[PDB]
Scaffold this active site. Structure first.
Site, PDB file in Angstrom:
ATOM      1  N   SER A  49       0.854  -1.254   0.001  1.00 11.97           N
ATOM      2  CA  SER A  49      -0.062   0.098   0.109  1.00 11.97           C
ATOM      3  C   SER A  49       1.018   1.220  -0.085  1.00 11.97           C
ATOM      4  CB  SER A  49      -1.019   0.035   0.985  1.00 11.97           C
ATOM      5  OG  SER A  49      -1.068  -1.298   1.812  1.00 11.97           O
ATOM      6  N   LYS A  52      -0.064   3.538  -3.003  1.00 15.18           N
ATOM      7  CA  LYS A  52      -1.077   4.626  -2.712  1.00 15.18           C
ATOM      8  C   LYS A  52      -0.582   6.019  -3.080  1.00 15.18           C
ATOM      9  CE  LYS A  52      -4.726   1.925  -0.652  1.00 15.18           C
ATOM     10  NZ  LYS A  52      -3.913   0.814  -0.579  1.00 15.18           N
ATOM     11  N   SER A  97      -6.081   3.364   3.955  1.00 14.46           N
ATOM     12  CA  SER A  97      -5.681   2.675   2.861  1.00 14.46           C
ATOM     13  C   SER A  97      -6.526   1.543   2.007  1.00 14.46           C
ATOM     14  CB  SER A  97      -4.673   1.528   3.641  1.00 14.46           C
ATOM     15  OG  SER A  97      -3.484   1.223   2.719  1.00 14.46           O
ATOM     16  N   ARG A 225       6.125  -1.155  12.407  1.00 19.62           N
ATOM     17  CA  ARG A 225       6.747  -0.147  11.537  1.00 19.62           C
ATOM     18  C   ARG A 225       6.825   1.069  11.789  1.00 19.62           C
ATOM     19  NH1 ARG A 225       1.658  -1.392   7.437  1.00 19.62           N
ATOM     20  NH2 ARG A 225       0.762  -0.803   9.420  1.00 19.62           N
TER      21      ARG A 225
END
Lengths: 242, 242
Positions: A49, A52, A97, A225
Site C-alpha cells: 500500500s 497509494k 488505505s 513499522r
C-alpha cells in the site's frame, strides 16, 4: 554521487522487537543517507500500500481524481476492514488505505498510462501484464527503501513530472502527524511477508526522509513499522523523547 | 440567513480558568453556529497575529512570497523573541509569528494593494489606517470571531479572490496539529489585552471552524487560548478525551 553511512547500532531496535528489517534515513540539508543495513536498504520488495502515493499522483494528473474532496462511493460489498464499507475522498482513502478505491483508480488509469507514468517517476522496476488492480502486491512491481527515498525527495520538491497542484494534494493526503516539534507525511504498507513505512519528517530547518521495511510473517506486529522508525528518529535526535 | 445557538454551558470553561472571553464554533455540514456569548462573538477586536493569515495570502498572490520555502534572512538585530533571531520561510514565520518578516511583506504589498485585497476578502472592518507595517499591531483594523469564521470558511473552500495555490500554501503554513482523529489548521494571536485562536478542525466526514478570543491582562495565560478551545471541542465530542 550519493553519501551513505551504515549505522549497525540501529539493529538493536529490530532485535529488541524480535524483528528483522531496514530503516533508511536521508538528511536533506547535509545530503547524507543513513541505514542500519546497506544491503537490505537496496533490496527491492513489493511496495504494497505504499503504492497509494504514485497511484494518487497519477489519478490526480489524469483527472481520475478531481480534488481531495471528490467522493468515491462504496461499491456495497461488505469487506473485513469496517472503515472500507463507506464513501471516501482522497484524504480518507489514504488514511484507511482503502484498497477498492485505489483498484478503481488503477483501472481508470489503465496499464499503458500507469506504466508510462511510473517510468516518468523512475519508480522501481515494473512488469504489469493483466494485473492493473493488483501489481503493487503481485508483483508486478518492486522498489527498494533507497528508491522510495529518491521518489519521495522528488515529490517533496514538486520535481515529479505532474503538476505542482497534484503533488501538493498528495502531500496533504499523506499527512499523518503534526505538532509543535515536527510534521510527518507518510504511507504505511502491508502485503504477506513485508511491512513498510515511507515518508518524511519536516522540522523548522530540515527535512528527514525515511523508508523502512520489515519481515512480517503474519499481520500481527503492524505497529512496529512506526514504532521502530520512531525509536531510530529518537536515537538520532530528529524527534523529541516522549 | 445564518443559524446561531448560544450555549452558556461553555462559560464554565472560561470560569474554571479565572478567564473571560468567547469561543465560536461552526459546523460546516449542518451550516450551524455555536457560541457561549453572541454579544462577544460579534465584538470586533484587533486581529493581532491572526492577521498573518490574510497578510500571507496577499504576499503569495502578489509574488512578494514565491513559495513556502523562500528564505527571509534574519537582519542580525537581537529581539526579545528568541525564535525571531534566525532565518525563516513562510512555515516558520507563521509558526513563530515573526513580526519583522510580516512587516517587510506589508511594506512590499503597500497600502493600496493591502486595502483592495482586504475589501476583496471582506476582512473585518477593512481599515488599514495608519502605517502599512503596523496597522494590525496598533492600528484601526478590527475583526470579530464570527467574521474570522466567514473568512476562514472561504479560505478552506479556496473561495477567496486569490489563486488556489496561494490558499493551499497558507493552509499548509496554518498546520498546527494532526493525528489519527483530527487535523487542526489554525493561527494564534496576541496583542495587549486580547488573545486569539482561530482556525478549523478537520474530521473524516466534517469540518468544524473555530474562533476564540479572551482577555489577556498580561502575556501569562497564553496556553489558555488552545486549552479552553479544546475543552469546548471535547464537551461537544468533536475531538476525543485525552
Amino acid at each position: 554521487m550519493k553519501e551513505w553511512q551504515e549505522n549497525k547500532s540501529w539493529n538493536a531496535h529490530f532485535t529488541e522487537h524480535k524483528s528483522q528489517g531496514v530503516v533508511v534515513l536521508w538528511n536533506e540539508n547535509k545530503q547524507q543517507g543513513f541505514t542500519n543495513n546497506l544491503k537490505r536498504a537496496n533490496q527491492a520488495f513489493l511496495p504494497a500500500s505504499t503504492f497509494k502515493i504514485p497511484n494518487s499522483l497519477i489519478a490526480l494528473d489524469l483527472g481520475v481524481v478531481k480534488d481531495e474532496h471528490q467522493v468515491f462511493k462504496w461499491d456495497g460489498q461488505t469487506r473485513d476492514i469496517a472503515t472500507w464499507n463507506r464513501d471516501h475522498n482522497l484524504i480518507t482513502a489514504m488514511k484507511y488505505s482503502v484498497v477498492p478505491v485505489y483498484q478503481e483508480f488503477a483501472r481508470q488509469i489503465g496499464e499503458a498510462r500507469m506504466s508510462k507514468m511510473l517510468h516518468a517517476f523512475d519508480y522501481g522496476n515494473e512488469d504489469i501484464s493483466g494485473n492493473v488492480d493488483s501489481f503493487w502486491l503481485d508483483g508486478g512491481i518492486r522498489i527498494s527503501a533507497t528508491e522510495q527515498i529518491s521518489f519521495l525527495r522528488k515529490l517533496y520538491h514538486n520535481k515529479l513530472h505532474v503538476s505542482e497542484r497534484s503533488q501538493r494534494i498528495v502531500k496533504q493526503a499523506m499527512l499523518t502527524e503534526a505538532n509543535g516539534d515536527y510534521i510527518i507525511r507518510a504511507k504505511t504498507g502491508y502485503s504477506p511477508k513485508i511491512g513498510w513505512w515511507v515518508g518524511w519528517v519536516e522540522l523548522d530547518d530540515n527535512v528527514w526522509f525515511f523508508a523502512m521495511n520489515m519481515d512480517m510473517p503474519t499481520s500481527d506486529g503492524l505497529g512496529l513499522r512506526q514504532a521502530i522508525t520512531k525509536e531510530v528518529l529518537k536515537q538520532e535526535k530528529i524527534i523529541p523523547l516522549e
